[PDB]
Design a protein around this ligand. Sequence first.
Ligand SMILES: [Zn+2]
Lengths: 82, 96, 214, 26, 662, 49, 87, 159, 47, 116
Amino acid sequence: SATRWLPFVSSDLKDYLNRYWAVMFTVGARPIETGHIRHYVSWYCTRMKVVLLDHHVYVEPLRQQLQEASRTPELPLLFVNK
Amino acid sequence: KASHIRIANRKRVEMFVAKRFHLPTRLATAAPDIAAEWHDELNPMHMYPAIIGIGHVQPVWWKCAICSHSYQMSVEKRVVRGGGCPQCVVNGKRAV
Amino acid sequence: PVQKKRQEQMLYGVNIPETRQMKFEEQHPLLAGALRKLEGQPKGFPFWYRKYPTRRHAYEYRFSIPVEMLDGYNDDVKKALSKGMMSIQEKQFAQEAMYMERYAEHDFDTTSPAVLAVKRALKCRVLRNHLLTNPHNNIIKTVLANTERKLNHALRRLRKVDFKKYWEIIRDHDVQDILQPPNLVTYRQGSYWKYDWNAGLAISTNLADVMDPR
Amino acid sequence: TEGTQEKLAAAIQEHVQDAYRFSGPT
Amino acid sequence: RLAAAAVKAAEWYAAENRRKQKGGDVIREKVDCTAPLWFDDTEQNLLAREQHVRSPAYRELHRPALTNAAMGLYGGEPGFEKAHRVWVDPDRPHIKHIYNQTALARNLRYARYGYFKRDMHLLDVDKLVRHARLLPTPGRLLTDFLYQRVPLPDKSCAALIRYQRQQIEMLEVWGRHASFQCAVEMFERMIVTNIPPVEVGVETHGEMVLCAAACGKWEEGWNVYANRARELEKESPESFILNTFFFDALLTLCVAAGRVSEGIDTLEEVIKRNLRPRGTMLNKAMILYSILGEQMSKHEASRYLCEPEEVEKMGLEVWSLFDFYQLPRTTASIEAYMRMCCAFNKPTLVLKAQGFADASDIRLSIECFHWLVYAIRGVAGFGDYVMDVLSQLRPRGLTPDFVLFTLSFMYCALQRDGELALAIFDQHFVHQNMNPTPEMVLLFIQACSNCEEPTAVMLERSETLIKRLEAVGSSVDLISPIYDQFLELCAHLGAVASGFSALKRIVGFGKPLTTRMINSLLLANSNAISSNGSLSMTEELVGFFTLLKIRPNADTEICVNLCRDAFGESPVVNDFIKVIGESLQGDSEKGEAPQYDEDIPVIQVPPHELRQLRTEWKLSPRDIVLRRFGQHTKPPGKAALDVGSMRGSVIPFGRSPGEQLV
Amino acid sequence: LKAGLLGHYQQEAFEARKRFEESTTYPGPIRAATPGDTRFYSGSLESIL
Amino acid sequence: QGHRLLHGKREREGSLFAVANDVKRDERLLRQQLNALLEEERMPTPLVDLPGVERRRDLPADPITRLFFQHKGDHALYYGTYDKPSV
Amino acid sequence: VFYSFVLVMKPRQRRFTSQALREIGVAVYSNGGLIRSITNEGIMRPYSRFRDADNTPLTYARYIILQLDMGEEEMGKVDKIIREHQDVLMALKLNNLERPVGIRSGNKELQAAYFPLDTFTRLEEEINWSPQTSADIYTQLEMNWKEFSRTRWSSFLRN
Amino acid sequence: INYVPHAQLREHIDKELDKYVAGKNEPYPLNFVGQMPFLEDGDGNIV
Amino acid sequence: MHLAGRNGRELSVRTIQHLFARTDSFAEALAVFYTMRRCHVAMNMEAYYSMLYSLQRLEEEGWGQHFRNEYEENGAPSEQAMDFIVKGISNALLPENKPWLGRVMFQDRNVPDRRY
RNA sequence: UUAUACAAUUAUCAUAUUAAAUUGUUAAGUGCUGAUUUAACCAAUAAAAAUAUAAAUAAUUUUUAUUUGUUUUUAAACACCAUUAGGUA
Ligand SMILES: [Zn+2]
């Protein structure tokens, strides 16, 4: 409206958490496990931001910070309410 | 918008004026016997009968075909008005 | 942004803050900053800075560079900064500064009516020259139709507030009928001269300097 | 100078059509 | 030699006319009314236009509108309730105010190009170029003319290249090449088409030479197109003849290119062809003779025909060629004649021509006042003539510009009178409220400094002119000669405080001190004995030569010796005089000439090169008012505010003031 | 004419007047010329009698 | 000497027109900051944040309201924090 | 750099390419312009085969970088000379050299906040970086690299 | 900036055309793309 | 100064204010001005204003010495001596009749006032 | 007595909302940038008289969209109606 549409991108994990309610960081090589979380979240009518980490500009900043919040190196991860 | 075509892949012209004027009035297309006498050495390298039209009023170099003489004539005087080699026309007056 | 562009055209260092780092430099340091740092020919302080307080004072070279700055360089650098290498915007700003040299009250003056009238007329000339080579540009038609009305307003107030400069501008550029009524039907009812009353210009003329008011 | 007669014929034919407007239908 | 060639061509044409009339039928000998000694090409086109106007088809087509008594009743009858279609000629209109802005009879939209595309076989392309709206580029106009297959004569090709030439004239100077290439491409399109019938005649070549003159191409106009027209003339005569328009285009090209000999050669070719030239041709010939006279003056000041005295004989006969045929004088003829007489250093002919312009009726064209002041530049005694010429502009409708004031101060500086420049400045320049150029201030202080017996009011006017020049900007760097002449004025007046306070301004602009400024300060200290100055002032002026950089001069030893008188011993000044006496003896032992203080030269440029502060405005108010190029002004949104549309009673606070939506 | 711009014009009518009394210098009292007769009397036309 | 006539409220109030070619540009903040640069701290006395009047006769006649006003020479102009709202 | 061109030319003999470049340079100098630089990049095999005047697809092509300082009308003249050359298959005109790309169409606040001299005074290789160029190479020019790189091969010569 | 003058134009063109030759005791520089082009010999024939 | 112009170092405001304070006469300070102009040294804009203010103050005491040299021999001042008291130097960068020409440039909002 | 006519339709008195956009032949990109893609080089275009109370301070112009004309070895193609080939655009 007052500003031109721009895709949101950031090198920090907490900038994604403070912006969206539900954030999910997936990979393109794991299509099944992201599809089950898409089914569960859309069943409860919740707005969700899916971030495909394949072809991202801040992969290694985000892959490091997801290892600190979750001790497992498992993708996808669901992040609700920071 | 407007569409364009490149004459001999070099000369960008508009498509409507090309089909009416630019394509059928080229030197290598309309008068090939005149364009065969084009001088390759003394003329500039960006000037050749594939892009230069018939009515080019500036004088270009012509290499004569019957005799061996290089001379400067305009392309419109050679095609439209009718031109020839100055050495051949002074040998034609000398012969007959 | 349309005012920041004209401020960059007029004043010299309005882009540079006290931090000496531009808005383009803080995000692109490898493109804006200098790559090599040379310890050689330091030019020092400019003692000739009084002659050029604004960029309209030095239009003989590119980027409003004075001739005192080009001393130690070879002729190729001075030729690449000459008048022949100027862009179209720099040539139009040189044409603007030619009249700004003639009609300004002070050196930082850009809003005098004699300056505003010739600026509107140069803009109308630029838009007409663009419409000559490209008559299918529909935005330039509207901008020319607005700029001609603004030029008429500027010249019509210049006629009342300073008649000598108006008459000089009319005589010098061979436009005598540039202030003419468009329609006879509106002119017969005095609506053309009522602009002199409605704009606040009806008693601008000093009667002792042109006539004998007795 | 030479094409004024055909322009005159077109103008008088237009005036004749405007007079044909008096007849109305058909 | 032009007048002798004119007399020779006139007597040859008279003898040829006499032998032809006595060979044909001896009918002109029976009439014996008159015989024209020349030939006029414009008489055929003017008589053809005058006979086209009086033709019955033109008078039937351009009849006025039929009245209501001529149509019929008061109304109700279809077809006769209005008038009929009215056709107007835009060059000779039989109605005033061809266009209108009414609600129903609005006709400005019907004057645009496209309504005249219905009849292009009958179309006149010069009237189309002059009177139409939203025309395309002339290449697309030629494409639309050749696409409809209409037989273009020479007039149509001349009109299309005239449209391209108007596009060239309206453009900037740095954008002339592309439109000229468009002109060359349209010309070759007109050559090689050959179906529809398109012929290139002498007017088309004249328009191409005019395009080359407008863009400024000598090698493209003279060598290519003029030679092509000459080849087409000599190859097939009696259907391709060079009229006066082609040679006028050639003279325009010779003026715009600076070529002098070719223009006089083509004017002699006009004369030898037994046809009369136009007045603009003689104006261009006088301009070329002015260029030749200025070049000879520059060549003799620097150190075909090396005799300058015969150039005046060949020049003034061009003015004598005006009264030869008929050729009435116009304003540009007066401008070119005064420019030519200023190029030959003859001011009496300029003073005669300025009265001859007021004799019949000629507007006196403020450039003519520039040449009026420039003609009397090196002639003493004409001060009140300059003072009266500046007063003559107000009854003639003119206002003085900066060029005329610089020429007046150039006269005052060359005649070094001083009081005339002050009289000009006090009651002619203060009321203008304009910005002075640095050349103007330079010539003013050159007039006031070099004058005999200057006054302090000249110092006041000079310092206030310097402050007014510093209050505004400039592009030229004349700071150092202006302050040099200001220090010379302080020398001839004796003010050392004003000249010493002016050193801080030379410091503030970064200009270096020279020996002439300190010599002027020493001469001011010699003449300061009533006002100011002491024995320490000459010591400080000695130190100005000593430690800065400045080498003393052979004029310095005169000024310090005059400052030695009536001031004191000052042994440091005596040691400086001994230092000067050693250095001036040693450099003379080396063999050098005695160097005195050089005088700053007075600028004597002609007014056509005097840093004109204007480029060009090619705006025409006719295309602004009639809205050519489709100028669209957006209307305001429902801002009528008319009383007939309102149908509600207006009460304060409205009908229902406070309404709550529940 | 637009009457709402009148009083501001009156301010200019002050400021043009007070400059005129301060800028120029009055040389002296000009002599009084005898006034003529006007041909623009009000009402209807009078007679030659 | 001929002097130019001041036309309009912007030229009669003496606007600087610091921004190039724009006569309708707002000027209150730049003029307020230049007037704040104009004042000086005098030591052998500065101004307060209360409102000011340009003349001593422009003080309010109420003695309690006069305590909230003071006399500033040319710093009494361009007072304020908010601007004129739009849209 | 005021103007730059990437000339794609037909791999002819050396004399023909030298005559073509000489005519281009004399057209630059005859119009009152200056050549900043001209560099040959050898014969490379492009991803698309350009066609000559006689419509034969050329597998190989020669790339030439030409940096000039010419006025606008004269640059138009030289561009119409270059684009209509018989040897030049393709030539792009770099006109985004004084102002960087993304300022005019990008943020409106970051439009008059740039300095044109920063890009005008440097060459085209300092604006458009090649893959071999980096900031380490530019810092190596001012770090007195002659006295530092003399011991860089002290470990490989013994094995 | 090292500009090319009009007199040193043909020599600079012949030096630039001799950048990629077959016989050279020096390593060849990379192009503007970062790729070694095809080497050639005299008269411009591609190796 | 040719060495300082070659090395490209800036002279501070306190440096030039102490440099021109050691000048006694007006002719000596113009030697320092045209030396640093010839040697192309760099400085701040406050260094240039404090330099030209010292050139303004040196001419003022130079004329005050001249007007007292004629006062001691004549016993009474002239009208030109009393006019020097009120007016002073007219052509000056920072004159006393407009005491606001040092507020934007100098960070102290006050001109440096030197005494002897 | 409406001093007011609720919405949506039937119909006439009619300004294209623009720096996110329009145009580019003599300038750009160009196989008609919209298949991928909410993001497209360069050039021209963002503001610029008084007055907001002032009783119309303004203009009578343009078409970016759809059809239809303008020329005939004078679109090779692709698409469409007679059925395999003509024309049409
Ligand atoms: Zn032959």
